[PDB]
């Protein structure tokens, strides 16, 4: 094959007296007719190359037929009915269903119909204590503004005219009298808490907080505890920290007491028991902790740990009279159950290694529900018995994939400097460690972003083709604490790549795959990961799949959106030492002729603001104008799920084809 007309400019740039040429500068713009014409030319070559693959269509068909499936949420009692969300798979918004014990279920609220075009979406949902009245917020178009509608649950008709000009608001009831919500005006950027009493006009809502100078804040929220005894008000000016106040509603005109009076830390209410407040906070605990303090004197100096901080970030849930501490260990879920007195009842016996959701309920819920999934198990709902700790299946996934046919196993491998690193490997059950399995190695590594297991239809399809999917939890991510993040940043970015390299090596040595049966993939920070790893070890793998990646390090910051990845990448505009470090790995700057690179397909949109196409365009030109091997270097430029399906189909087809497959490793 022959690549398009990629002429070489001369735009040389100097950094610390050092001279580095940039033959492909023009491409840095995605409007210039010489560039936009380039795209058209490049896509013609890619599509032309892909039209060559025999089984691409078959792959697309399977992806398309399994891409969408029905879903159901956990049931929850409100008044005399059990409510639950469902989605037939093609509905844009989830539909809320209802069922009275002894009768068939019925649609209760379908948000899709509110808008003849579906632009009116359901936001917050909140029932009165007796479950007879429903308050819910709707967002129109795509506005931050909201309206709170009130509905009589039985008649399913408007109870009062909707509350207007509501924003960044929760909806919290005080018994069956009314509820607290937040707004910016008179139901300035001074957010205020109001109380709307049922049977009254919005204009008469009582201003609860935010009016006097001392209470001015950009964001305020209000929550009434489940027993209706305490009102908690949070106030903040940014995503960093918040003030918190409490008011004992069991007393007449009780004043507000300060739980936390500064913005030096996040603190939020979990629940109360009697006069004891249970709070989650990161004050003096980066990984957070759950503390208690009496409402009558709630200041920080009086908080006492109930669940002390740990090495893993804490998240707390409450239901059925218990507290559930959820953590991420080696990127997978762990849940421990505690009573309200601090006693550790047990560790919840989760279905396996993966991701969970749930464990949220009322004080008197007889049982709790939680969700579980991983690379080999689609989202499943389970019933958890608080006392016995017994778990039972509530609703299996409707996804067209039999869980029993797939396996996911965790492995740990040592990198260059000896650092231990997690790695989850998934494949159809029955695989042989003969080193012949076609494999895709995925990684990210960076921005404290950790890769937790999640079910992907695309991935499941890959497994059905007989492929192996491997995800590595590289440094730079947030799987092992703050230290794990920096261990792969600045002039330590190379550590991330070494972790990736050892991952590949490990997969072979263990008999999973082998060099010719291995491909690596990643997007953005991940797109860089594949870019580098491929330039430093273009022998380690057979196929490279860099998507929406940042490939020009020596000057990425010179791009609008690219001016937010400072803390991690650093720039060639800090020191010649940093500059040197960047050049040393910068994918774009590490591609040289005479070198045989693995088959490569770079993917990007025609125009994108988050990660500019230049990184992919220029990088493409380079590889084409450098590779001295028989493997093609291509670029696919995007111009709905249909597009995601087509994209996944092109990637799997290209991969298998480049591994020398005439037919699919396994007929799905």
Rounded Cα–Cα distance for residues 140 and 145 (Å) = 8
| Three-state DSSP class for residue 52 | coil
* Segment holding 574, helix H or strand E: none
Contact 434, 511 (CB under 8 A): yes
State both tokens at 493: 């970015």
Rounded Cα–Cα distance for residues 317 and 300 (Å) = 22
State both tokens at 434: 């003969």
Please state, in angstroms and as integers, the Cα–Cα distance from residue 290 to each residue in 270, 286, 330, 340, following that order. 9, 12, 22, 11
Rounded Cα–Cα distance for residues 494 and 488 (Å) = 7
Contact 596, 627 (CB under 8 A): yes
Rounded Cα–Cα distance for residues 117 and 97 (Å) = 21
Listed residue (258, 264, 208, 211) closest to 236, CA to CA: 264
Tell me whether residue 160 is exposed, middle or buried, using C-beta atoms within 10 angstroms of its C-beta: 0 to 12, 13 to 18, 19 or more. Answer: middle
Tell me whether residue 121 is exposed, middle or buried, using C-beta atoms within 10 angstroms of its C-beta: 0 to 12, 13 to 18, 19 or more. Answer: middle
Q: Which residues pair with 127 in a beta bridge?
A: 134
- Count of beta carbons in the 10 Å neighbourhood of residue 456: 15
Experimental technique behind these coordinates: X-ray
Hey, CA dihedral for 332, 335, 336, 340, is it positive or negative? positive
Torsion of CA 444, 450, 454, 458, to 10 degrees: -10
Rounded Cα–Cα distance for residues 30 and 612 (Å) = 9
Q: 483-496: buried (b, 16+ CB within 10 Å) or exposed (e) per residue?
A: ebbbbbbeeebebb
Enter the CATH code of domain 70-398: 2.130.10.120
Contact 286, 311 (CB under 8 A): no
DSSP result, 480-529: S-HHHHHTTSGGGHHHHHHHHHHHHHHHHHTTS--GGGEEEEEETHHHHH
Longest dimension (CA), the chain: 83
Rounded Cα–Cα distance for residues 225 and 594 (Å) = 69
Q: CA neighbours within 13 Å on the CB side: how many for 84?
A: 16
Rounded Cα–Cα distance for residues 642 and 625 (Å) = 33
Rounded Cα–Cα distance for residues 86 and 84 (Å) = 7
- The backbone region for 223, taken as left when phi is positive above 0, alpha when psi lies in -120 to 50, beta otherwise, is beta
Query: 40 CB contacts (<8 Å, ≥6 apart)?
Result: none
Listed residue (258, 257, 256, 303) closest to 282, CA to CA: 303
Rounded Cα–Cα distance for residues 388 and 376 (Å) = 28
Rounded Cα–Cα distance for residues 233 and 258 (Å) = 10
Rounded Cα–Cα distance for residues 571 and 557 (Å) = 7
- Count of beta carbons in the 10 Å neighbourhood of residue 454: 14
**At CB < 8 A and 24+ separation, what contacts does 320-324 make?**
320/361, 320/362, 320/363, 320/364, 320/365, 320/366, 320/367, 320/368, 320/386, 321/363, 321/364, 321/386, 322/386, 323/270, 323/271, 323/278, 323/290, 324/348, 324/359
Please state, in angstroms and as integers, the Cα–Cα distance from residue 491 to each residue in 238, 494, 495, following that order. 30, 7, 9
Contact 165, 144 (CB under 8 A): no
Chain position carrying tokens 């929760």: 170
Where do breaks (C to N over 2.5 Å) occur in the chain, by preceding residue number? 187, 639
Q: Which residues pair with 160 in a beta bridge?
A: 150
Contact 439, 519 (CB under 8 A): yes
Rounded Cα–Cα distance for residues 659 and 656 (Å) = 5
State both tokens at 216: 């001015």
Phi, psi (degrees; rounded to nearest 5) at 81: -130, 160
Q: Which residues pair with 262 in a beta bridge?
A: none
Tell me whether residue 10 is exposed, middle or buried, using C-beta atoms within 10 angstroms of its C-beta: 0 to 12, 13 to 18, 19 or more. Answer: exposed
DSSP result, 371-432: EEEETTEEEEEEEE-TTT--EEEEE---SS--GGGEEEEEEEEE-TTS-EEEEEEEEETT--
Query: 580 CB contacts (<8 Å, ≥6 apart)?
Result: none
Contact 121, 93 (CB under 8 A): yes
Q: Are strands 368-374 and 81-87 parallel, antiparallel or unpaired?
A: unpaired
Rounded Cα–Cα distance for residues 626 and 589 (Å) = 12
State both tokens at 365: 């819920």
Torsion of CA 448, 453, 458, 462, to 10 degrees: 110
Please state, in angstroms and as integers, the Cα–Cα distance from residue 258 to each residue in 198, 232, 261, 262, 463, following that order. 29, 10, 6, 10, 55
Cα angle 251, 257, 261 (rounded to 5 degrees) comes to 165
Tell me how long the chain is: 668
Rounded Cα–Cα distance for residues 485 and 196 (Å) = 45
Cα angle 607, 613, 617 (rounded to 5 degrees) comes to 130
Q: Catalogue the E-assigned strands of 16-171.
A: 18-20, 71-72, 76-78, 81-87, 95-99, 106-109, 121-127, 133-139, 145-152, 157-167
Is domain 1-69+399-668 given the CATH code 3.30.365.10 in the classification?
A: no
| Three-state DSSP class for residue 42 | helix
State both tokens at 49: 């190359």
| Three-state DSSP class for residue 26 | helix
State both tokens at 661: 């497959």
* Segment holding 620, helix H or strand E: helix 614-624
Please state, in angstroms and as integers, the Cα–Cα distance from residue 222 to each residue in 167, 261, 395, 660, following that order. 13, 16, 34, 61
Listed residue (481, 457, 497, 447) closest to 648, CA to CA: 457
Measured in whole angstroms, the distance separating CA 565 from the mean position of its chain's CA atoms is: 18
Listed residue (310, 312, 292, 311) closest to 302, CA to CA: 292
* Segment holding 603, helix H or strand E: strand 599-605
Measured in whole angstroms, the distance separating CA 666 from the mean position of its chain's CA atoms is: 31
DSSP result, 542-595: SEEEEES----GGGSTTSGGGGG-HHHH--SSS-HHHHHHHHHH-TTTT--TT-
Domain boundaries, the chain: 1-69+399-668, 70-398
Give resolution in angstroms.
2.2
Q: Are strands 468-472 and 439-442 parallel, antiparallel or unpaired?
A: parallel
Cα angle 168, 169, 174 (rounded to 5 degrees) comes to 170
Rounded Cα–Cα distance for residues 654 and 541 (Å) = 15
Hey, CA dihedral for 522, 525, 531, 532, is it positive or negative? negative
State both tokens at 563: 């001016």
State both tokens at 340: 């309200």
State both tokens at 9: 């400019």
Rounded Cα–Cα distance for residues 239 and 442 (Å) = 31
Torsion of CA 75, 79, 80, 83, to 10 degrees: -20
Please state, in angstroms and as integers, the Cα–Cα distance from residue 178 to each residue in 136, 161, 228, 245, 572, following that order. 13, 14, 12, 20, 58
Query: 281 CB contacts (<8 Å, ≥6 apart)?
Result: 260, 265, 266, 267, 268, 288, 289, 291, 303
State both tokens at 467: 């492929």
DSSP result, 238-256: SSS--EEEEEETTSTTPPP
Contact 345, 339 (CB under 8 A): yes
């Amino acid at each position: 094959l022959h690549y398009p007309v990629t002429r070489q400019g001369e735009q040389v740039d100097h950094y610390f007296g050092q001279a580095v040429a940039d033959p492909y500068r023009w491409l840095e713009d995605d409007r210039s007719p010489e560039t936009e014409a380039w795209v058209k030319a490049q896509n013609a070559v890619t599509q032309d190359y892909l039209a060559q693959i025999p089984y691409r269509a078959a792959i697309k068909e399977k992806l398309a037929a399994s891409w969408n499936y029905a879903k159901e949420g956990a049931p929850f009692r409100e008044g005399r009915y059990h409510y639950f969300f469902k989605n037939d798979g093609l509905q844009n918004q989830n539909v809320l269903w209802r069922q009275q014990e002894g009768k068939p279920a019925e649609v209760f609220l379908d948000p899709n119909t509110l808008s003849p075009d579906g632009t009116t979406a359901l936001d917050q949902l909140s029932f009165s204590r007796d479950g007879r009245i429903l308050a819910y917020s709707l967002s129109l178009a795509g506005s931050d503004w909201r309206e709170i509608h009130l509905m009589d649950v039985e008649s399913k008709q408007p109870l009062e005219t909707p509350l207007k000009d509501v924003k960044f608001s929760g909806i919290s009831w005080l018994g069956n009298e009314g509820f607290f919500y937040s707004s910016y005006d008179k139901p300035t950027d001074q957010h205020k808490v109001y109380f709307h009493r049922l049977g009254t006009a919005q204009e008469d809502d009582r201003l609860v907080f935010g009016a006097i100078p001392a209470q001015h804040h950009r964001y305020v929220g209000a929550t009434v505890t489940e027993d209706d005894r305490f009102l908690l008000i949070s106030a903040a000016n940014s995503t960093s920290g918040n003030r918190l106040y409490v008011k004992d509603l069991s007393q007449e005109n009780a004043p507000l007491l300060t739980v936390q009076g500064d913005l030096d830390a996040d603190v939020s209410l979990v629940d109360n028991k009697g006069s004891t407040l249970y709070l989650l906070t990161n004050r003096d605990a980066p990984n957070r902790r759950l503390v208690t303090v009496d409402a009558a004197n709630p200041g920080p100096a009086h908080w006492r740990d109930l669940i002390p901080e740990r090495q893993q970030v804490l998240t707390v849930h409450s239901g059925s009279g218990y507290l559930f501490a959820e953590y991420m260990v080696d990127a997978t879920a762990r849940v421990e159950q505690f009573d309200y007195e601090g006693k550790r009842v047990r560790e919840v016996a989760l279905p396996g290694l993966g991701s969970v959701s749930g464990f949220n309920g009322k004080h008197d819920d007889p049982a709790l529900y939680f969700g579980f999934e991983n690379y080999a198990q689609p989202p499943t709902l389970y019933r958890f018995e608080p006392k016995s700790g017994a778990i039972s299946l509530y609703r299996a996934s409707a996804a067209p994939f039999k869980p029993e046919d797939y396996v996911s196993e965790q492995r740990f491998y040592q990198s260059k400097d000896g650092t231990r690193v997690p790695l989850i490997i998934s494949y159809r059950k029955g695989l042989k460690l003969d080193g012949s399995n076609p494999t895709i190695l995925y990684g990210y590594g960076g921005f404290d972003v950790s890769l937790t297991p999640s079910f992907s239809v695309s991935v499941a399809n890959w497994l059905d083709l007989g492929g192996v999917y491997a995800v590595a939890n590289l440094r730079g991510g947030g799987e092992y604490g703050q230290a794990w993040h920096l261990a792969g940043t600045q002039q330590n970015k190379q550590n991330v790549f070494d972790d990736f390299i050892a991952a590949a090596e490990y997969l072979k040595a263990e008999g999973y795959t082998r060099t010719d049966r291995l491909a690596i993939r990643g997007g953005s920070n991940g797109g860089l990961l594949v870019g580098a790893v491929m330039t430093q070890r273009p022998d380690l793998m057979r196929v490279a799949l860099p998507a929406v990646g940042v490939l020009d390090m020596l000057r990425y910051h010179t791009f609008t959106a690219g001016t937010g990845w400072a803390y991690d990448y650093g720039t060639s505009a800090d020191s010649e030492a940093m500059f040197d470090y960047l050049k040393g790995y910068s994918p774009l700057h590490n591609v040289r002729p005479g070198v045989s690179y693995p088959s490569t397909m770079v993917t990007t949109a025609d125009h994108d603001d988050r990660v500019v196409p230049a990184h992919s365009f220029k990088f493409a030109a380079t590889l084409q104008a450098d590779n001295a091997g028989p493997h093609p270097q291509l670029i696919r430029i995007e111009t709905p799920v249909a597009k995601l399906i087509e994209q996944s189909a092109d990637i799997y087809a290209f991969t298998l084809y480049e591994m020398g497959y005439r037919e699919l490793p396994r007929q799905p």
